[PDB]
Amino acid sequence: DLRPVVIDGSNVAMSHGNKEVFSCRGILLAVNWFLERGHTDITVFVPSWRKEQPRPDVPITDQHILRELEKKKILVFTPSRRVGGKRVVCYDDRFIVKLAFESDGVVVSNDTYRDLQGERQEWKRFIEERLLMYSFVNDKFMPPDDPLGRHGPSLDNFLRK
Ligand code: NA
């Protein structure tokens, strides 16, 4: 029944808590929301530099959650590294999109990826049809019952095949 679920870990962690803080529980909270409904195939994507320790230079909370979810075969780090002077991160976005697209699943994010809509035509289609936004109120992950709006489908149908 249930469509595969690809979450954008950075979109979510940033949303949750302080907007200027990578809040890892946001990620957990999202994952459980899908775990409670019965979903078993969930990928969260997050860049690999988010493991390093510490980045007292980038604010973050409950970092230990990231490896916990990697262990449960849900979180997957995206590649990154330090080239010459600074840093180089393989867009999280392409992994998130590709995966969902190639698994005919859904993407949990409030990013619409207007660049990736623009690059490939087929992807623009997919995002319009299968992005799933949300709001957080404190620790409460609240996705809409009307994900495409009055005219599209009910949330339960959105998560089915
Ligand atoms: Na945050």
Author numbering: 134 to 294
Sentences from the paper on this structure:
Regnase-1 (also known as Zc3h12a and MCPIP1) is an RNase whose expression level is stimulated by lipopolysaccharides and prevents autoimmune diseases by directly controlling the stability of mRNAs of inflammatory genes such as interleukin (IL)-6, IL-1β, IL-2, and IL-12p404567. Regnase-1 accelerates target mRNA degradation via their 3′-terminal untranslated region (3′UTR), and also degrades its own mRNA8. Regnase-1 is a member of Regnase family and is composed of a PilT N-terminus like (PIN) domain followed by a CCCH-type zinc–finger (ZF) domain, which are conserved among Regnase family members. Our findings suggest that Regnase-1 cleaves its target mRNA by an NTD-activated functional PIN dimer, while the ZF increases RNA affinity in the vicinity of the PIN dimer.
X-ray crystallography was attempted for the fragment containing both the PIN and ZF domains, however, electron density was observed only for the PIN domain, consistent with a previous report on Regnase-1 derived from Homo sapiens. This suggests that the PIN and ZF domains exist independently without interacting with each other. We found that the PIN domain formed a head-to-tail oligomer that was commonly observed in all three crystal forms in spite of the different crystallization conditions. The amino acid sequences corresponding to PIN (residues 134–295) are the two non-identical residues are substituted with similar amino acids. Both the mouse and human PIN domains form head-to-tail oligomers in three distinct crystal forms. In contrast, our gel filtration data, mutational analyses, and NMR spectra all indicate that the PIN domain forms a head-to-tail dimer in solution in a manner similar to the crystal structure. The previously reported crystal structure of the Regnase-1 PIN domain derived from Homo sapiens is nearly identical to the one derived from Mus musculus in this study, with a backbone RMSD of 0.2 Å. The importance of residues W182 and R183 can readily be understood in terms of the monomeric PIN structure as they are located near to the RNase catalytic site; however, the importance of residue K184, which points away from the active site is more easily rationalized in terms of the oligomeric structure, in which the “secondary” chain’s residue K184 is positioned near the “primary” chain’s catalytic site. In contrast, R214 is important for oligomerization of the PIN domain and the “secondary” chain’s residue R214 is also positioned near the “primary” chain’s active site within the dimer interface. Within the crystal structure of the PIN dimer, the Regnase-1 specific basic regions in both the “primary” and “secondary” PINs are located around the catalytic site of the primary PIN. In the absence of target mRNA, the PIN domain forms head-to-tail oligomers at high concentration.
